[PDB]
Design a protein around this ligand. Sequence first.
Ligand code: HEM
Ligand SMILES: Brc1ccc(-c2c[nH]cn2)cc1
Length: 367
Amino acid sequence: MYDWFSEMRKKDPVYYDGNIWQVFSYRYTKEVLNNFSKFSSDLTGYHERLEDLRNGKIRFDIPTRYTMLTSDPPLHDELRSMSADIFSPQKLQTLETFIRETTRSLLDSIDPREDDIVKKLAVPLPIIVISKILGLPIEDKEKFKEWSDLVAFRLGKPGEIFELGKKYLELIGYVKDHLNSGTEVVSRVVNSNLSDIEKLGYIILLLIAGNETTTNLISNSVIDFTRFNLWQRIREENLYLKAIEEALRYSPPVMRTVRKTKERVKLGDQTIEEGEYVRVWIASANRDEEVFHDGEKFIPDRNPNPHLSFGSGIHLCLGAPLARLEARIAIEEFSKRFRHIEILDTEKVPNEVLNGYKRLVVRLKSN
Ligand code: HEM
Ligand SMILES: Brc1ccc(-c2c[nH]cn2)cc1
């Protein structure tokens, strides 16, 4: 896919295909993400329905349509300010011990003759941590994996990232049943003046939305380090942080995101009408030569590395510090426990926005 990115970057970085607008270069990507007053995140009509949600006129709707992810200021800032302290680096550092012991406990269950590190390490780790942070118990190990998988690009429903159905109704039920069992962040949302619909939305978003993406950051990291044979340079030169930032730049777990225009705007020398959808290719922008020298080479100590894999502007990923911390510990521990890694079989995640592996079968040499 990167092949096409390169050519669109050179010949056509702002491109209308007759359907929607697409952006490929770093400069125009960054400006669409930052300029919240011209490029809206309100894809589900959250602002337009806010009053009727709160006053009860809307009795039923899909809770995950009305979260901070699909809102603009001030509503976005108001929603986000309720949990921003919890996910900041300062507060998360508390958790470094829990993550490190959970990681090790997981590395134990691995069979080095042959195992799937997606199934034994990459999938469980984010689920266990977010559950700790939120105070919600993992009743069924299996249904958390399933619910985590409900996250997906839905065609025709922009800004919707959850697949619906009976699995979804279960998620909602489970959340109602544990409302009053949560930690600090959950209490704040519950006691707030949000509608019940928004509360469910808020919690489900935090519980679920970040699992698969983190799983993918871990897997992509393992893959990239192996294929370019960097495992021992990364370790002897202690490059975990900058290496993982490079995995993020090179193999982003989220490939693209979308905005809608609030008004006629001029992006480069194109004119986008008011009301158009603008698809922003994070993955292409992460390799724009104008910003990254040798953009198609993986460079584990790269610096500076201002990639957009967590986005930019007011929606910059709430979970970015958490994701960096989980990834880094997991790599480190893995890296000290095994020294030779052979990749036997892979299965990519087959869909288009999310970029990772469903299976990653390896054989390992342990120390
Ligand atoms: C490698 C892991 C992750 C990646 C690559 C990633 C990527 C992103 C991106 C690109 C956005 C921007 C959305 C947009 O502007 O349209 C975003 C926003 C967001 N992410 Fe993540 N994410 C990751 C992990 C997490 C985790 C662990 C959490 C929470 C537990 C999380 C929760 C959120 C939330 C709540 C937003 C919306 C924040 C706002 O709108 O102000 N993500 N993420
Ligand atoms: Br589709 C799609 C699925 C998940 C995300 C996300 C960003 N941060 C945590 N999860 C974004 C888009």
